[PDB]
């Protein structure tokens, strides 16, 4: 019988890895593609310095991380361990959005 | 004919430039006129701030057995100090990550 | 030239990785599209500010210091990009 | 030929060698430090500017800067900064 | 048998009554005593303009009602109607307090 | 002259009124002392700012405009008492 | 033989004082140089903002059968538009109260 | 007599009298309006100074405060306020 | 050698530019606008003539013009149009 961990043990393992880690978690080239796509809506023919795109990527990553830990606080507050979208709307609406 | 030019940072015994910060206040559009001791005081305040945060960063890097400071070490320095975190709750550090922080209920048993 | 549907370019496993860094161990499958929407709204706000700054700069190219101005004016200040 | 760009690399480097003779830096960490010092300088200077506005003083002094530091910096960071700045102001006055 | 309202009925009538109203909720003189007590702990012999007290008051009820609106939202997020201390702690932590 | 106990001056019925303004349906008994602590934290956080402005102004009496500054520094700007 | 002193607020056809706001920017310490059209633009945008919020206050007063504005009308005016809420998310109104708002689960069956 | 305290009440009376000739004013609400206009004035002026710094421009003109209004004031009021301001500055251009 | 026929193309083109700098116009749509402005102008002018006739006034004044604006234009269009015309005649009075 091939080896298989129980669920969550693996999850805590990459929790430890990725919370230890420092690098960006999302793929780069779709992030330039997306920022070009959405900046296309406001003004035409925009050119992007790679440093600006990286700074946007880090800001987005930190904003999402803060949102996710707030939803963690909300989820453990509701005596559950699995997050649901109303945690996200709650966290944003308490935050002021 | 003229006295030897002596730097004002040496007069204040400080590493941060008194003249540059003084010029920055003069072109920073904060007041029409600036007192002489105010940039000296500000440079001393900043020098203490950078001194303590660099001490924390060096201690954190020595914990990581690295002789050169890393943005990860800087994030560890900011978030593991409550008082600097209260200073800097709204800041984002590039490639800094976050603290190792797992909620107790998330652990097994 | 025209790009149409890069909103799903933020893949599901990337969101799982971000939740891992967020400290989430268990993530519902109904999470990802709202997180795409929230990221979407946030990026709209910041790049709208960014293109406003850049259009004031009379430049056709967006630059990094304009982006970090947009973030600090939005109250999510960035360090490490020429500030 | 390019135009010279201002930085705080040498001062922070001297301060690091003062607190830690054996330690180095990464350039990304130095970028964070430049953003840090510029940010704190902007915060304190703007706060002092509105204090100068509020008492209708067109002259900014180190008393105003001290008021801004006590107002913004939480905890004993403020009083340590006041002590260091007070020492610096006194030994500048004597020199 | 004397009339007696079911629990919550007078509570909701209080909700409507105090939410339509704008007049003050804190007795001003024990509050002013608390203000002077905290003030003399930092600088002695402080004197107060009445408007300074009033503003300190308006701001405090503003901050508190912000917390209880957040508390109500997080409590109905928690499938309860009774608020508990962990909820106010959660609201402060999500706000970054 | 000196005062030692006025946190109880924010009475439990007063906190009940505050909760009714906030839309609170049911109030636990443990809420009140916590609200006393949180209110104490906020009022001390703003009044240290206020006393800082008053000592910088070389005045002995607290003015309302300084309190307005003290609230707007934490971004909790109160309208109507400026000027 | 000087021409009659006519006013810049009338020159822009606007009610807010152009000269006072221009002076207030000049000694408000935002730049050493300032253009002539900037106080005109600024007076225009504040007049538009006051015009729309005073429209909302007037309708709120008339709906409550009051011919005099009260701060309760101001609070009801600002909070009933989401875009002004994004303008005024962190702003406190004295004696304003809150919107009449009951969570739906709080209501009885 | 006491020295003058300049305020923004009577202009609010005039603009309301244009939009609603009939209504009355309570004085603490009038103070709330003065706080509104002073607050928005400080926000726009700070953004104007910030943008004049970033483009290294010595002069506050209508064009960057238009940029600032597009930054701070959102959406519908932003575009309409831009409309009235451009109309006003063109009218002042025609003296 | 020719004789002029007057039109409203220049004014509608201008006000189109203040309301929308970036939009164009077709000439037949401008003919539609010419018919529109002439038709509304003749309606208001004839109704103004009848109002002047009813109360035995030989002078046409802005008051009955305002009356005719309430008379023809329904509700919202009427109240806002009365507002702009009122403020406009205030500037003309000050001129």
Residue numbers in the entry:
A (entry chain K), E (entry chain O): 37 to 133
B (entry chain Q), G (entry chain M): 10 to 118
C (entry chain L), F (entry chain P): 20 to 102
D (entry chain R), H (entry chain N), I (entry chain H): 30 to 124
From the article:
Here, we report cryo-EM structures of human H1-containing tetranucleosome arrays with four physiologically relevant NRLs. The structures show a zig-zag arrangement of nucleosomes, with nucleosomes 1 and 3 forming a stack. H1 binding to stacked nucleosomes depends on the NRL, whereas H1 always binds to the non-stacked nucleosomes 2 and 4. H1 contacts DNA with L1, the amino-terminal part of α2 together with L3, and α3 to stabilize the nucleosome and contribute to chromatin compaction.
In all structures, nucleosomes 1 and 3 form a canonical stack, whereas nucleosome 2 is located in a DNA loop between the two stacking nucleosomes and is rotated relative to the nucleosome stack. H1 is absent from the stacked nucleosomes of the 4×177 array, but is present on nucleosome 1 in the 4×187 and 4×197 arrays, and is present on both stacked nucleosomes in the 4×207 array. Furthermore, exit DNA of nucleosome 1 shows the highest Δβ value for the 4×177 array, which is the only array in which H1 is lacking on this nucleosome. Altered linker DNA trajectories, as observed in our 4×177 array, sterically preclude H1-linker DNA contacts that are required for stable H1 binding. To confirm that our observations are not a result of low salt concentrations, we solved the trinucleosome core structure of the H1-bound 4×177 array at 60 mM NaCl and confirmed the presence of nucleosome stacks and the absence of H1 on stacking nucleosomes. Stacking of nucleosomes 1 and 3 is apparently stabilized by H1 binding to nucleosome 2, because a published structure of a 3×177 trinucleosome array lacking H1 adopts a non-stacked, extended conformation.
